[PDB]
């Protein structure tokens, strides 16, 4: 169909909580080669976040079972692998859209940071299930994506920008969960938070709720990565 029709259909899918449909619609919109509007951009994000999120959730469940178990463990192992394949395909799907459309077509700094963040995210998800002579590359792919987004965001965006704050959140999570570097993870989270807090006046009546939420998520991870 056409952009608007696909965008509305994707909105319907989301309402129906049918994120495969939503992701498929937004993928088709993206494949139309045109730079995505903020709305379309967010739809694509939300859709694949749910799609990958399911496999990620399932992966952890099965993974936690494969380890806590012979004939059973072999079955659980094969099932986990099955989920991983789904998980990876999804990630590679997103990452492909990012290399071919989103990142290149990103004209404004805002778009650039957003898609670079997304690239880091899904390489991070790949990293979550990476083991061996692929894990190292994957982890570095994510880091470099995050790092570039982080640089651009600091230079072109105010500390309270939802995209910048969201980047800090996920970048911090990457350092802790992927790189096993708590202090680095915490410092990044603490910095983004404190910087934003000191400048809550730059907020926008259309982004304040997004910014404030992300700030709460930042501190949450921070307290998590300290108490036990």
């Amino acid at each position: 169909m056409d952009k608007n029709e696909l965008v509305q259909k994707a909105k319907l899918a989301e309402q129906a909580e049918r994120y495969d449909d939503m992701a498929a619609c937004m993928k088709s919109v993206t494949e139309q080669g045109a730079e995505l509007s903020n709305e379309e951009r967010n739809l694509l994000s939300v859709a694949y976040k749910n799609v990958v999120g399911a496999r990620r959730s399932s992966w952890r469940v099965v993974s936690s079972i494969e380890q806590k178990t012979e004939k059973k463990q072999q079955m659980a192992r094969e099932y986990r692998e099955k989920i991983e394949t789904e998980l990876r395909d999804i990630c590679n799907d997103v990452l492909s859209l990012l290399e071919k459309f989103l990142i290149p077509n990103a004209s404004q700094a805002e778009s650039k940071v957003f898609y670079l963040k997304m690239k880091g995210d899904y390489y991070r998800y790949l990293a979550e299930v990476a083991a061996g002579d692929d894990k190292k590359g994957i982890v570095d792919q994510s880091q470099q994506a995050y790092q570039e987004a982080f640089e651009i965001s600091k230079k072109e965006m105010q500390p309270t920008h939802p995209i910048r704050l969201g980047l800090a959140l996920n970048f911090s999570v990457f350092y802790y969960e992927i790189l096993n570097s708590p202090e680095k993870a915490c410092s990044l989270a603490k910095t983004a938070f404190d910087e934003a807090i000191a400048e809550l006046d730059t907020l926008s009546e259309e982004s304040y709720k997004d910014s404030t939420l992300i700030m709460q998520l930042l501190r949450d991870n921070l307290t998590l990565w300290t108490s036990d």
Binding site: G166, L169, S172, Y176, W225
Partner: peptide, 7 residues
Amino acid sequence: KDKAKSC
């Protein structure tokens, strides 16, 4: 440790 929250 538990899974951290993200965007």
